[PDB]
């Protein structure tokens, strides 16, 4: 009958609503996190360490492959140019010889001697000149990018950045998920891969995550100012009308790298940010033990750049949590847990009108 | 040289604008100046569909005008019976960041997708009785923003990678790729004969595409900001666009230009969704200020307001028989209006 099919529809609906109640308990128990950073922020490495404690870093050998292939074809094509390029060093020095030998080697192992062999070739101006004619012959598009990054791929700790996965075509997933738990509290972290750099539409999906993890390379200043682009992006996230209730966890990730430059004279911060010359270290700054005052003054200045944005238009609805960090730190998962505990507690105190 | 190709694109832009000006003999407001107004449209909420945990991004009516599928970013497709408010199916998604959903005209399939860049086809008529994935369509390099079935085997998608694509479902392959937009394509709308479709993108332009030939026939400019929503007029000779510039605009295909702008000085928020009534006299538009405005499509006057959502109206849909309007919202509720 009409009411017999209606009771069959009420019974299928009750079987759905029981399952939806069990799904509701899982959803309210899990804190969702959007991990966001400038491309070379150290983020991806932060995702690697957080995973070994409990798909992006797996593809490090595909980026291994492109740089070597790019070096092979240029030294090989060097012959085929009508004026075969003279290498600035008349002798190969065996760097050219080793690269010839490496041709078509299945499952190459990329030893340290292979890199210095490729490293010294690429700086040779003769090879430098053979790259303007690289347009003439067949070459991969990510040739120069990875070749200028020989230094970075050296280290065995190398985890490729988003821009590295962008130059190659390895990324296929739009959103990478990393599930973990701290103190039996489930966390769902989402990293963005294979989306274009125009973020203004897809960033609206994350208006009700617990926090946006915004990782920044503090060593970036001196991409002219990787740090100013990090500051404009933070400013747009902080002042977007749909993200106006979403808190932002802030990690300044290259504390050790930032440090080597400030001690070196390899920084000159007051060129890209002229207000650093009249900036003083704040009185509530508590530096790490055995830390230089030149490091601490540069460390808290980059923090005060991001806090100058967030103290305007904060209004007690969403909060910025800055952390001085390094990408492989073991404390980091804990720092996310403590900020998410502070976010949930501040949300409940607003609902009781206590904060 | 590209300097002379810059000026060649400028003078073709001059020629098209003068060819549009010469056909502009009289505006739509002057033609419809003496038609009777529709009066105040007073719709009310007849059903409130509760059960989604998080914000709803999309909905699509069934062609039976009774069933509808809604997509929420809790990772669920819920198929509702809008008459009885019973949930018919609850489909867990592999990826929770769904941005679009589509109900197939035969009623046998639903599609959905989002930040996973994948249009997942779900079979609603399996032989055991559960709902399983029949196909995952991979090949977009940006988020899936809109999808619409052409039939059981064909579906057109739009994407954040600035392209649209026609898919063969049983093979999983892209039959046709539709390129030419320079921003994220946010919305598409099929023509009533499904030989054409229009797409609205984040380059403030709308493009009319031929489905079988795969080319852009016409490009429509006039909006100031990103086009979030698009819908054909019921005869298929015109379409309406919703934008972040707080205006709706009506574009005619055969006149190749904008006929009407639906705006108000007290409206400063963007449009997320647009749909026509069955005769095309009313243009319903969802807004960021949590309301839906009913517009007189011929006179550009505001005829009513659908108020009652407590968050952003994300999607809007009119039944094929014209009986009801569904509105989905970021407050996790769907409302049915008459």
């Amino acid at each position, epitope marked *: 009958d009409q009411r017999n099919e209606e009771k069959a529809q009420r019974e299928a609906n009750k079987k759905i609503e029981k399952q939806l109640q069990k799904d509701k308990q899982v959803y309210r128990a899990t804190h969702r996190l959007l991990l966001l950073g400038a491309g070379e922020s150290g983020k991806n490495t932060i995702v690697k360490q957080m995973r070994i404690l409990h798909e992006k870093a797996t593809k490090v050998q595909d980026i291994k492959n492109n740089l070597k292939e790019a070096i092979e074809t240029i030294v090989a094509a060097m012959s085929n140019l009508v004026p075969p390029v003279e290498l600035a060093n008349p002798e190969n020095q065996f760097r050219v010889d080793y690269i010839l030998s490496v041709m078509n080697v299945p499952d190459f192992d990329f030893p340290p001697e292979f890199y210095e062999h490729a490293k010294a070739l690429w700086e040779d101006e003769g090879v430098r000149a053979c790259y303007e004619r690289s347009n003439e012959y067949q070459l991969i598009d990510c040739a120069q990018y990875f070749l200028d990054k020989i230094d970075v791929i050296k280290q065995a700790d190398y985890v490729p950045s988003d821009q590295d996965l962008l130059r190659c075509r390895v990324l296929t997933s739009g959103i990478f998920e990393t599930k973990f738990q701290v103190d039996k509290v489930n966390f769902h972290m989402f990293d963005v891969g294979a989306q*274009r*750099d*125009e*973020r*203004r539409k897809w*960033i609206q999906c994350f208006n009700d995550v617990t926090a946006i993890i915004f990782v920044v390379a503090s060593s970036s200043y001196n*991409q*002219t*100012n990787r740090l*100013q*682009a990090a500051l*404009k992006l933070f*400013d*747009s*996230i*902080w*002042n*977007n*009308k749909w993200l106006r209730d979403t808190s932002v966890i802030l990690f300044l990730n290259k504390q050790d790298l930032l440090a080597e430059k400030v001690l070196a004279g390899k920084s000159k911060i007051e*060129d*890209y*940010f*002229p*207000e650093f010359a009249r900036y003083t270290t704040p009185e509530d700054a508590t530096p790490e033990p055995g830390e230089d005052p030149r490091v601490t003054r540069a460390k808290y200045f980059i923090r005060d750049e991001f806090l100058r944005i967030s103290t305007a*238009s904060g209004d007690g609805r969403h909060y910025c949590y800055p952390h001085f960090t390094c990408a492989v730190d073991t404390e980091n998962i804990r720092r996310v847990f403590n900020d998410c505990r502070d976010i949930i507690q501040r949300m409940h105190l607003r609902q009781y009108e206590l904060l | 040289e590209l300097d002379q190709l*810059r000026q060649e694109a400028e003078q073709l*832009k001059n020629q098209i604008r003068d060819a549009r000006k010469a056909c502009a003999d009289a505006t739509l407001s002057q033609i419809t100046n003496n038609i009777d107004p529709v009066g105040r449209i007073q719709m009310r909420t007849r059903r409130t569909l509760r059960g989604h945990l998080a914000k709803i991004y999309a909905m699509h009516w069934g062609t039976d005008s009774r069933l509808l599928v809604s997509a929420s970013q809790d990772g669920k497709l819920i198929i509702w019976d809008s008459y009885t408010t019973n949930k018919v199916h609850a489909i867990p998604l592999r990826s929770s960041w769904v941005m679009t959903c589509a109900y197939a005209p035969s009623g046998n399939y639903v599609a959905c997708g989002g930040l996973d860049n994948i249009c997942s086809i779900y079979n609603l008529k399996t032989r055991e009785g559960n709902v399983r994935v029949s196909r995952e369509l991979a090949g977009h390099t940006g988020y899936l923003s809109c999808c619409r079935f052409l039939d059981d085997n064909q579906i057109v998608t739009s994407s954040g990678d*600035t392209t649209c694509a026609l898919w063969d479902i049983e093979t999983g392959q892209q039959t046709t790729t539709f390129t030419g937009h*320079t*921003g994220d394509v946010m919305s598409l709308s099929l023509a009533p004969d499904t030989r054409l479709f229009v797409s609205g993108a*984040c*380059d*403030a*332009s709308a493009k009319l595409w031929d489905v079988r030939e795969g080319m852009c026939r016409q490009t429509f*400019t*006039g909006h*100031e*900001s*990103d086009i979030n929503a698009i819908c054909f007029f019921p005869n298929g000779n015109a379409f309406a666009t919703g934008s*972040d*510039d*707080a205006t709706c605009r009506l574009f005619d295909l055969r006149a190749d230009q904008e006929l009407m702008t639906y705006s108000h000085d007290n409206i*400063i928020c*963007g449009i997320t969704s647009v749909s026509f009534s069955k005769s095309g006299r009313l243009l319903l538009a969802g807004y960021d200020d949590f309301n839906c405005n009913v517009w007189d499509a011929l006179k550009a006057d505001r005829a009513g307001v659908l108020a009652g959502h407590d968050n952003r109206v994300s999607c809007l849909g009119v039944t094929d028989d014209g009986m009801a309007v569904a509105t989905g919202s970021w407050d996790s509720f769907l409302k049915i209006w008459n």
Partner: nanobody
Amino acid sequence: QVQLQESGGGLVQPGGSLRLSCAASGFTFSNYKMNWVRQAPGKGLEWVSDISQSGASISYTGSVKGRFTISRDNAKNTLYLQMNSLKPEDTAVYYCARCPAPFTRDCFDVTSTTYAYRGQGTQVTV
């Protein structure tokens, strides 16, 4: 149709001066935040300066502070960049870039590679 046409960029000596103009059409100019963005050779796009809708809130990147001046004339629908004390590092294609949505404080994507609301650019060579 949104159109931004930059003008005023030419060869200048180091320490010289140059005034850039961005002729805007196809949108309500006073409703939008406006930006100047530049692209050095071999580099990516870099934000230079912005200005609010009324012209009150003005910010610059650090390397141009004290040297570059941004202004708008809302009646004439035009954006200005007054570039004083030009260095050879200022050699770039300078782009006038509109914020994507009106009446907003956030200004996304204006330095993106294929951003739509950005002019074709004028070459400034120092």
